[PDB]
Design a binder for this molecule. Structure first.
Ligand SMILES: Nc1nc2[nH]c(N)nc2c(=O)[nH]1
Ligand SMILES: [Ca+2]
Length: 314
DNA sequence: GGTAGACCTGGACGC
DNA sequence: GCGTCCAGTCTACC
């Protein structure tokens, strides 16, 4: 009862609601789609993970997003804690307005959107976003998710335990920059990205000016931000775009990799024109990104998330 | 200045 | 059962 992960039905008094129609958010299409790798459906329709340094379990009904938090007497989330959730999901951005616009300028989008409503972008923490996507290159979501969990258990602050799961906060720069982190990460299976993690943590702390340097990119322009990030080891144009889009508030950033290339060719009959190559390459990848921005506009990155998410399910 | 490969890891097919 | 695929970044080179 008071033990293990909660369900809306098991502990009614501990949940609080946030008005949110399924049309504005579908947890099942957002949480396991490669935006964040830290949420798990521990119980059917109930997703648990760390949000704003605390463990939460989320679940939804047709018109409500139900939330519960494990912090000391167990109690429902406060209005302020709930705002933390609203902010994580950027609920002030009306998805219905965006879907309308995209669908109006892109007939293909309209068709896909009908069956994949509620795919919005999470507003993630820069550090977590940076290192999680550093682990994402030349990799699959399943493996990435494992890698990220092991990284947090080994170097992140211990939070609370539910059932046999011990939640950890994401590691700090100081921790990832520590001595012998690379070796430990290799034993955890990060492969060659183990060095990228250690090297990038040290680079930010010892060559770029610290956490402030990263957090500052939020106020900088997409072009500036994207350029700064590519300086870090293991961070190319794609990883940088993911970080810009999901943690630095650059809604126009469009991450281009295999999935978007497939979508471009199959659903838009797209082909590079200005680029030299015919297939994927730094020149053609940049061109595709421009194509999507030209098609969808200022929130092209968000539109990308809808089709990308839909392409995973497919 | 724009390519070819090599690359940790492990679930997928293909046979 | 097994060998080749496959889910971006970096770096020798033409
Ligand atoms: N385009 C794109 N690539 C991704 N890779 C990972 N890991 N997540 C994403 C995503 O949301 N979009
Ligand atoms: Ca690939």
């Amino acid at each position: 009862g008071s033990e293990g992960h909660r369900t809306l039905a098991s502990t009614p008094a501990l949940w609080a609601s946030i008005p949110c129609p399924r049309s504005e958010l579908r947890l099942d299409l957002v949480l396991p789609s490669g935006q964040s790798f830290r949420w798990r459906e521990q119980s059917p329709a109930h997703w648990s993970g760390v949000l704003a340094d605390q463990v939460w379990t989320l679940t939804q009904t047709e018109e409500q997003l139900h939330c519960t938090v494990y912090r000391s007497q167990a109690s429902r989330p406060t209005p302020d804690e709930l705002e933390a959730v609203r902010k994580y999901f950027q609920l002030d951005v009306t998805l219905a307005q965006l879907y309308h616009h995209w669908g109006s300028v892109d007939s293909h989008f309209q068709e896909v959107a009908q069956k994949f409503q509620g795919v919005r972008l999470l507003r993630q923490d820069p550090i977590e976003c940076l290192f999680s996507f550093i682990c994402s290159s030349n990799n699959n979501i399943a493996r990435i998710t494992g890698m990220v969990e092991r990284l947090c258990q080994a170097f992140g602050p211990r939070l609370i335990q539910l059932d046999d799961v011990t939640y950890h906060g994401f590691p700090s720069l100081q921790a990832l920059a520590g001595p012998e982190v690379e070796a430990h990460l290799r034993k955890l299976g990060l492969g060659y990205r183990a060095r990228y993690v250690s090297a990038s943590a040290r680079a930010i702390l010892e060559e770029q000016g610290g956490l402030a340097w990263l957090q500052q990119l939020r106020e900088s322009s997409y072009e500036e931000a994207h350029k700064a990030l590519c300086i870090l080891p293991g961070v190319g144009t794609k990883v940088a775009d993911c970080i810009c889009l999901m943690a630095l508030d650059k809604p126009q950033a469009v991450p281009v990799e295999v999935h978007m290339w497939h979508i471009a060719q199959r659903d838009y009959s797209w082909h590079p024109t200005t680029s030299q190559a015919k297939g994927p390459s730094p020149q053609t990848n940049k061109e595709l990104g421009n194509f999507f921005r030209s098609l969808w506009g200022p929130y092209a990155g968000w539109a990308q998330a809808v089709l990308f998410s839909a392409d995973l399910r497919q």
